[model samples]
Target: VSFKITLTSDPRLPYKVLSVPESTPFTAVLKFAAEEFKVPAATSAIITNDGIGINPAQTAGNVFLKHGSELRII
Candidate 1:
């Protein structure tokens, strides 16, 4: 299944909605965010809406997600 993700932290992005597969890793999302926002991958971070770091090793579906899962990336 796929989940629609929104980047709540970066409002300057031209677009923020991403349809990601559940099998994808959370790191992949962070990697994409870093590239899209023109920031170094090492400088970027992914946290849940409630303010917590997401494990890069966890799967998308197992981590933070629902129909419109919101994430904070900085």
Candidate 2:
């Protein structure tokens, strides 16, 4: 399904224009951030689809994405 991801932090683009799938990883989101804001891929935080920060030790597969959920990376 399509969704909206809003960047809550960072000074770059701070937003993505695409419909993300549930299987999509937070890493992919960061990549999109780079493309969306024309910023380097290195400046982004992997946040949960629920607007929560993602735990590195945690598996992103468990993070099911919802429609119109905004994620802000610091």
Candidate 3:
């Protein structure tokens, strides 16, 4: 499954266009962020509009991920 990830903290690109496995962990998202932005994963935080932030060990499919689900990495 693909996640709709948005990055607002960094002014470069707030809206992202990417996809990853549903079984992938939020940490993987952080990795992707690190690679794409050329920044360290420790510098960012992933959050939702509902105020729930996924743990690094949690899988996207089990926590927050769907074809249309939206997430923010700040």
Candidate 4:
């Protein structure tokens, strides 16, 4: 299954809504965000708006991510 969510590296820039598989790893999600935002994934991190870091080995579904969820790449 897949769900839509937004990703942003900067609040000043528009976020991208991506259709990601629930089974996708957080590392892949970080890579996707990096590709879209032109950031370096190796140096970047993905976090919730509440500032909780996501584990790279965790799947989106494992994190209980739902449609319209927002994530940050930093």
Candidate 5:
């Protein structure tokens, strides 16, 4: 299975939507988001819209990510 996730850092700016495989790691997702937003990957992190931090070692299916989930880059 795959998930369609929305990523954004600023509410006023346009967000990015990505279709990721269930086996994809959060590390890759974080890197993608950081690159998309022009942020330093080492200093950046990914969080859920509700402010919950997502572990980089976790996969999309492991984290129970669903379609249309919103994630923020921080």
Candidate 6:
């Protein structure tokens, strides 16, 4: 299923989760965020729905998201 993701920093992008599975390394999420937002992977961070910080090595696919899952650039 597809999640509705909102990027708070840029007003031009709207890509939800990456194509990788939930078991995929969290690095994949960072990669998507960095590339999609045109920022460095390390320079960006993904905050989970539970207010957890997402690291590259973690499992991004496991993020618990409901409707309107969002991530803001900091």
Model 1 pairs whose backbones collide: none
Q: Which ten residues in a row have the lowest lDDT in candidate 5?
A: 1-10
Candidate 5 lDDT, 1-74, residue by residue in tens: 33334445566755677666778886887788678777898998777778777787978666654423565777
What C-alpha RMSD separates each model from the true structure?
3.2, 4.5, 2.8, 3.0, 2.9, 3.8
The residue pairs that clash in candidate 5, if any, are none
Q: Candidate 2 lDDT (Cα, whole model)? A: 0.54
> 1-74, model 4: which lDDT tens digit per residue?
33333455466755766666788876787788788778787988767777777777878776655423566667
lDDT of 4 at 49: 75
Q: What's the TM-score of each model vs. the native?
A: 0.68, 0.50, 0.69, 0.73, 0.72, 0.58
Ranking by TM-score: 4, 5, 3, 1, 6, 2
Can you write out model 2's per-residue Cα lDDT over 1-74, one digit (the tens) per residue? Answer: 33345655555645665655556665776667657766567766656565566543322344433323444555
Candidate 4, residue 53: the lDDT equals 78
Q: Which residue pairs show backbone clashes in model 6?
A: 22-61
The number of clashing residue pairs in model 1 is: 0
Query: Per-residue lDDT for 48 in model 5?
Result: 72
Query: Which residue pairs of candidate 3 clash?
Result: none
State the local distance difference test value for candidate 1: 0.65
Q: Supply the TM-score for candidate 1.
A: 0.68
State which candidate, 2 or 4, has the greater TM-score.
4
Instruction: Sort by lDDT, best first.
Output: 5, 3, 4, 1, 6, 2
- In model 2, which regions exceed 4 Å deviation? 8-14, 48-52, 55-61, 65-68
Best by lDDT: 5
lDDT of model 6 at position 37: 65
* lDDT tens digits by residue: candidate 3, 1-74: 56667776577746665676778786887778666765667777667766566566777676554323677776
TM-score, candidate number 4: 0.73
lDDT by residue for model 6 (1-74), tens: 23344465666755555455667765766677677667776677766556566555656455533322355443
List the global CA lDDT of all models.
0.65, 0.54, 0.67, 0.66, 0.68, 0.57
User: Candidate 1 on 21-47: residue-level lDDT in tens?
Assistant: 888987887788677767788877777
